Structure 1
Amino acid sequence: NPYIYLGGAILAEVIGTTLMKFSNGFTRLIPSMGTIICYCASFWLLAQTLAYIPTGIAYAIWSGVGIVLISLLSWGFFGQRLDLPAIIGMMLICAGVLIINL
């Protein structure tokens, strides 16, 4: 249960930072409101998922799946350019998730 909401907050911050890159400096109304909604929800998600799991544990898993999912949908949006260090490092933190998650 707790790592379902943590991963949900991971998906929320990632969508918020991508809609921020779409909109300009608090300009494009539809993604700007999308950023405010994604943030106020992710903050309300982190404020509820941190009382369950240790704070430092959710910090790591989020910092991990954060860049992992940010770069995951990066190749599926711009055809981003990286290679072996990115993909094996993804499975590295992903393996680190397994030993801090269930």
Structure 2
Amino acid sequence: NPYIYLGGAILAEVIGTTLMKFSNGFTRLIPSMGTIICYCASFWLLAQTLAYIPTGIAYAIWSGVGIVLISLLSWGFFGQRLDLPAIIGMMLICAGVLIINLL
């Protein structure tokens, strides 16, 4: 049950981040209000995980599934804007994040 509040906390920020791509610099009403609602709900559900589960575990799970979801919700909604050297660079950034939190 508490290992699910994080799954709702990541996804809520996932939606709020991709809706921010639609907010048009927070100048468009409905996408501007959407990111605020989703970020507020993710905070409140994360505020329920910071009791049972610790910090790095609940955060590395976020950063892992988040980077794997908001990046997949980047081609399905427009495709591509720009690409540069390696996607493996993202893989080793995550590997770099994982060896200071867990380790």
Do these two structures clear the TM 0.5 threshold for a shared fold by scoring above it? yes
Structure 1 segments (4+ residues) deviating >3 Å: 80-102
- After alignment, is 71-80 or 4-13 more displaced? 71-80
Alignment RMSD (CA, Å)? 4.0
- For this pair of structures, how many residues does the alignment match? 102
Normalising by the residue count of structure 1, what TM-score does the alignment of the two structures yield? 0.74
Structure with the higher fraction of residues in helix conformation? 1
Deviates more, 1:75-84 or 1:54-63: 75-84
What secondary structure, in the 3-state scheme, does the structure 2 residue paired with 1:68 have?
helix
Identity %: 100
1:54 Cα deviation after fit: 1.1
Residues 68 and 90 in structure 1, CA contact (< 8 A), matched pair in contact too = no
- The one-character-per-residue Cα deviations of 1:4-27 (angstroms, maximum 9, x if unpaired) are 111111110010011111012222
Mark the runs of 5 or more structure 2 residues left unpaired by the alignment: none
TM-fit CA distance, 1:86? 8.8
Q: CA deviation at 1:96?
A: 13
Cα deviation, residue 78, structure 1: 2.1
Describe the shift of the 1:22–1:63 C-alpha distance in structure 2 as closer, same or farther (beyond 3 A): same
Instruction: Pick closer, same or farther for the CA change 1:44–1:73 going to 2, 3 Å.
Output: same
Q: Which moved more, 1:21-30 or 1:86-95?
A: 86-95
Structure 2 SS opposite 1:86: coil
Whether the 8 Å CA contact 2:2–2:48 is kept in 1: the answer is no
In structure 1, the gaps of 5 or more residues are none
